[PDB]
Amino acid sequence: GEELFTGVVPILVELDGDVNGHKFSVSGEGEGDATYGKLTLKFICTTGKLPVPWPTLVTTLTYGVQCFSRYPDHMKQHDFFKSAMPEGYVQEATISFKDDGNYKTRAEVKFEGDTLVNRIELKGIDFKEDGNILGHKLEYNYNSHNVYITADKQKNGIKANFKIRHNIEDGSVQLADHYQQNTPIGDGPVLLPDNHYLSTQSALSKDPNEKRDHMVLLEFVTAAGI
């Protein structure tokens, strides 16, 4: 499980979304290096313009690559994500935006050959047209935050929760809560962790030679708390 992440592993992310009557698709490619908890990815909207801002989709597009988190040696027995590989896990997440709508997501994370794949489906409901999301009022950045993980022994998986603070153009913040649940696909044994967190930091950029709606992401994820 942990053995498949000793080097640089290619990543494939495919998302099919539906936010307020607007159907879209995002294709992501890149590489992950778990030894340094480094993720370099390029996301492209293949259906045209993204109906929502790119920062709102960061958690949806990256919660599936939490397997590239650097777990310090003394914490390695708490790495659920890598232990479920190659068969992987089915994950679900609800991203609730304060005073606005919510994203209901489901993803299948597994190895397809020597490549880590994320097949995601998103359903965005009850969003205000005058809101920060559909009104595209959010800044093109993503703050550093923690991802709190706890074990779910009944379903042989984990649960993850954290608060997101999206930066609005006027200087204010748009709050959001991400509640995640992971359950293994295969019949093999997984590592059930004690309470800990993943310290994340992200840099959002653009490819100067790209005309399609896109997002280039550099992300560092490190486990801590124990």
Side-chain angles (χ1 to χ4, degrees):
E2 226 150 47
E3 55 156 315
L4 300 167
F5 294 90
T6 48
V8 181
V9 179
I11 305 166
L12 279 179
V13 178
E14 295 299 318
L15 164 68
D16 285 322
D18 188 328
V19 184
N20 279 37
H22 294 99
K23 292 179 180 177
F24 67 102
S25 291
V26 174
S27 183
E29 289 181 38
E31 53 181 56
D33 196 342
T35 306
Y36 309 103
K38 194 176 190 177
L39 289 156
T40 42
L41 290 150
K42 185 187 175 187
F43 294 103
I44 308 166
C45 180
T46 55
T47 51
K49 295 180 181 185
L50 204 77
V52 290
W54 283 104
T56 65
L57 294 184
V58 171
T59 74
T60 295
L61 295 163
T62 56
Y63 82 127
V65 295
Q66 280 168 348
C67 59
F68 293 102
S69 299
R70 182 186 73 81
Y71 269 74
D73 189 83
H74 73 286
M75 286 187 68
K76 280 190 192 302
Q77 71 272 33
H78 302 290
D79 194 346
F80 163 81
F81 310 108
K82 292 186 186 55
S83 71
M85 298 304 165
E87 299 103 302
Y89 47 86
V90 164
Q91 47 176 36
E92 280 173 16
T94 303
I95 302 89
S96 312
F97 297 84
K98 193 181 182 293
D99 306 318
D100 221 317
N102 63 91
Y103 291 156
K104 279 178 188 173
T105 72
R106 188 187 181 274
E108 190 181 286
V109 184
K110 60 169 179 171
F111 261 88
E112 287 280 45
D114 292 325
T115 306
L116 190 278
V117 175
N118 285 180
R119 291 202 303 162
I120 323 163
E121 281 189 294
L122 175 145
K123 202 179 76 183
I125 67 165
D126 300 304
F127 281 95
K128 297 172 175 174
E129 290 182 286
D130 52 276
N132 295 303
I133 299 88
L134 292 185
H136 294 257
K137 305 179 188 182
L138 303 182
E139 291 178 358
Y140 190 65
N141 52 49
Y142 192 77
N143 303 330
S144 301
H145 65 86
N146 295 318
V147 178
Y148 303 92
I149 300 165
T150 186
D152 188 16
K153 286 184 172 292
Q154 298 176 283
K155 290 179 181 180
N156 235 254
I158 61 129
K159 281 173 175 171
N161 186 248
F162 61 96
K163 285 285 188 298
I164 316 152
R165 289 148 212 83
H166 289 305
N167 307 294
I168 309 170
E169 55 183 34
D170 59 5
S172 184
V173 292
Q174 167 64 67
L175 279 153
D177 179 88
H178 178 103
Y179 195 81
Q180 175 188 328
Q181 279 192 87
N182 298 55
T183 307
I185 291 169
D187 47 51
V190 291
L191 293 167
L192 295 171
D194 285 331
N195 293 0
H196 71 284
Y197 65 91
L198 304 175
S199 179
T200 71
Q201 49 182 91
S202 313
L204 273 54
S205 56
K206 297 296 190 188
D207 185 316
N209 303 313
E210 183 66 78
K211 285 98 168 292
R212 295 170 287 174
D213 204 357
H214 69 297
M215 177 175 70
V216 173
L217 170 62
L218 165 61
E219 195 178 272
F220 290 97
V221 192
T222 306
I226 293 166

